[PDB]
Write a protein that binds this ligand. Sequence first.
Ligand SMILES: O=c1cc(O)n([C@@H]2O[C@H](COP(=O)(O)O)[C@@H](O)[C@H]2O)c(=O)[nH]1
Ligand SMILES: O=c1cc(O)n([C@@H]2O[C@H](COP(=O)(O)O)[C@@H](O)[C@H]2O)c(=O)[nH]1
Lengths: 257, 257
Amino acid sequence: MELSFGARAELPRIHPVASKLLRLMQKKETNLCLSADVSLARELLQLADALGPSICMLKTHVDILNDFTLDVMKELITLAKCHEFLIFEDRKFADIGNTVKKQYEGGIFKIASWADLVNAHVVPGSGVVKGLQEVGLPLHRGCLLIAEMSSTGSLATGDYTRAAVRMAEEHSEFVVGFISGSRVSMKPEFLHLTPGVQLEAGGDNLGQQYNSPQEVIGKRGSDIIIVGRGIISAADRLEAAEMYRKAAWEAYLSRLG
Amino acid sequence: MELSFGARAELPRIHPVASKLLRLMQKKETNLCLSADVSLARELLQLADALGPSICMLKTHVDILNDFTLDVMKELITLAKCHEFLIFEDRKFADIGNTVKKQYEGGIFKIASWADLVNAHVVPGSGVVKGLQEVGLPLHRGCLLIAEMSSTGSLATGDYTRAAVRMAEEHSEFVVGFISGSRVSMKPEFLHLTPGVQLEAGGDNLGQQYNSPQEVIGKRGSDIIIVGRGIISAADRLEAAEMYRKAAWEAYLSRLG
Ligand SMILES: O=c1cc(O)n([C@@H]2O[C@H](COP(=O)(O)O)[C@@H](O)[C@H]2O)c(=O)[nH]1
Ligand SMILES: O=c1cc(O)n([C@@H]2O[C@H](COP(=O)(O)O)[C@@H](O)[C@H]2O)c(=O)[nH]1
């Protein structure tokens, strides 16, 4: 009863952004999201161009880009369209609804104008989603809810994770899935994206913890791996991305049987 | 055994940023933080100048400022120095440590260069604080942890709130207090700042809930009220700020006896 990405793209209740994503994952044989955690626009764009064919999604932190402009993001959209990947701004909205709507639409980043996907913490209660969706529904955007975190001491466990799943499942006109370590919803209309991924065991010195693509996708049932330093600190980022793509894709196929 | 703000400023374990704040609160008879939730730099600066004498702190959301530049923030520092208030960027850092350090120091906002105080959600675990403090300790900054939220459905309750208090109390070289609805720590070295404040009962249509300064300061034991729309939507923002200042200050005095 587990469906391929291409069949999930057709589910009756699928969000159009999720459907677009699932179709390109199936087409390109990729369930890799690049975490493009760089500070230079040129590096961001060169990574997006070279790695675009290997990825289903490019995750940004626009607020670490020392030379952000909206024209950078126009360039990034051109590459996303060319290579067929979604743009996910990993802003982690986490305020009351009236504040996050402004943070999403406005200021100098105008996130909603260029990001297919954003994400939110569930700690404020469902007003965080209601505020975002007042901006994002008109613009045909989607949102991911942070149900679990990869870092040591995370409080996104137990009843908190359950609250995130309920909040999704109840805002499914806008919420398309989760940031999580594992499959947290049994409804196949929801995407699961998992950060904290490297091929080798380890972590960082600021609480990051790594698990492998086989563990995350194959054993824990997630859909997509989010990989930053495992790719971006490598010398050859293209070959690193291909290693991660092949790992995540085979883990998905093997789970699917 | 409850101490005045001026005596708390002298406590052995007080953080220098908390001490500076407590001294100016005592001097100016203000425990009001203006939530300057505007999109124009000119309005931000005109509010800071006119209301500066009435406030202990000005809370920003730099990411909704349509015409942000670092020169705006230089102007804002000049006013903070003139009128004696701290600048609190309400960024709600909420990522792994390695990410938040970059978000705090870098990008176009360079938050650490101008904000006396920032805040963080505790959901990622203590690496969020460790990452921020790698930037903020050298720059002699402070941080507030979000222990409770004002909005409907908040998950910052129970064991989550307790985890926030522990995390503070254990990073007290950098963490100076809390965003909370009430006094959550019994240690008087920690500040309690409470949003969701208006004189009249009510809320908004996106989950905000209001309580009065007398309730928050006088009954719930908080130190500082954070007020946005109750001031900024009023016609005369100066008189509105004075009403809130007088309310919060008298509630503090009456609690102190
Ligand atoms: O639980 C979570 C949620 C995240 O978004 N992230 C993000 O995913 C990326 C992980 O990067 P890296 O692979 O270099 O550790 C970072 O951008 C981080 O902000 C995470 O690491 N853990
Ligand atoms: O629990 C919390 C935490 C906050 O920082 N805030 C912030 O405090 C301010 C409240 O503004 P207002 O008084 O207009 O409702 C907003 O900037 C909001 O982001 C809040 O309302 N509740």
